[PDB]
């Protein structure tokens with residue numbers, strides 16, 4: 001055994017001059033990176049009108065279809081403060097109406113929350129870096145805050161000037177404990193076996209290992225000099241080897257902060273045992289970011305050439321985009337091949353071809369990303385207003401004729417990423433149908449005389465989320481009609497006959513469009 005405390009001491013000495021040279025502005029900066037600054041709950045609540053308090057008190061927050069997971073969590077802690085001023089029956093009653101309460105929000109509820117989200121952003125450098133993938137000019141937060149982020153990130157980059165060096169880099173390992181849900185909320189919930197939680201589901205594991213070949217860090221990784229025993233939710237244990245010129249800084253209690261924008265090549269992925277629980281070891285080696293970007297671009301070129309051919313498109317149509325910057329990079333890239341495969345397997349070749357030609361005619365894109373959708377230009381160039389921007393698993397944006405699919409998050413009511421894609425392709429089918437109906441006044445076919453009536457009657461029969469509005473109802477019905485599960489296709493035909501009819505009609509109408 002090679003001594004944890006001597007390893008520590010030697011890395012501390014390597015950075016001792018650097019540490020002692022830090023101004024205390026420098027020190028403040030590093031602590032702020034480590035410990036984000038949260039919103040002041042009191043002030044938020046103090047600023048609500050009495051009518052807004054009453055609303056926030058009674059509102060069900062997971063009914064939202066646009067808030068991030070971070071925003072959703074904060075709001076719930078905010079509901080609590082609001083509520084601790086009540087009777088025990090009030091509190092119990094208000095929680096009593098929560099069981100059969102999967103329903104869509106009222107319009108005055110949604111409008112309120114959409115504006116409230118501008119006021120509950122933490123100031124959190126590493127989160128801002130990961131969310132935007134390093135592209136911090138993205139107009140998804142207030143301009144003034146955005147500029148404060150830029151100054152801080154620039155100053156941190158300038159503090160991290162000293163590399164680990166030629167002597168240390170192949171003598172030490174660095175460690176990082178991770179929650180599986182921070183890479184894939186989908187595989188996360190089902191990689192710990194259900195029979196036994198101390199075991200790893202070998203099938204999912206082979207899937208995860210399958211193309212986990214590279215990884216990108218767009219923020220500043222905090223790593224441990226010595227391995228720390230896992231917490232509850234920490235089933236991923238990274239062991240990282242740096243490169244000689246990897247720049248880093250010493251943090252107290254045996255940590256290193258690494259420079260942003262590095263690449264990691266996955267060298268090995270194993271199941272290992274640590275006190276009768278199973279964990280996943282991930283061995284990784286720091287490489288230059290550009291190397292991995294080169295691999296991403298070649299994959300993008302190759303998936304487009306493959307799909308340009310299969311779709312009867314010009315050879316150099318830029319159709320599929322990899323917008324990839326985060327720790328599960330290579331899976332995003334590989335997952336897109338499989339998603340597009342399930343798409344061609346479950347939808348008529350003529351429908352797919354005629355609609356995708358329409359998207360390409362409007363300079364459209366299939367964007368596969370691991371940054372948040374508000375930070376994708378296919379959304380933000382057409383949605384100036386932050387209160388109108390959407391976080392979700394998937395989005396169709398008609399103004400840019402693009403489908404956006406966010407890899408890392410897990411969609412409610414979804415079995416996988418392929419299902420999510422097909423629902424988005426449902427919005428695009430709705431778009432083209434409305435255009436064919438009326439080529440100058442290009443509107444959505446769900447905004448038509450007919451379909452509104454159909455929705456007013458059958459709008460409650462299918463999925464809970466189908467009850468939101470005409471657009472979503474259509475999209476869900478379209479998704480269920482092309483499910484791999486046979487039973488799903490028929491429940492639509494039986495529980496909502498007119499919609500079934502109406503969609504199959506539009507599909508006919510589209511395929512029957514020509515030269």
Ligand SMILES: Cc1cc(S(=O)(=O)N(Cc2ccc(CN)cc2)[C@H](C)C(=O)NO)ccc1F
Pocket residue numbers: 062063064065066390391392393394395396411412413414419420423424427465472479
């Ligand atoms: C069920 C489902 C969800 C999504 S989604 O999660 O990506 N999504 C909506 C959303 C629904 C439900 C909830 C919480 N119950 C939150 C958000 C977005 C806005 C959407 O309508 N894109 O067209 C995509 C495909 C799906 F089949």
Ligand SMILES: [Zn+2]
Pocket residue numbers: 423427471472475
């Ligand atoms: Zn939708």
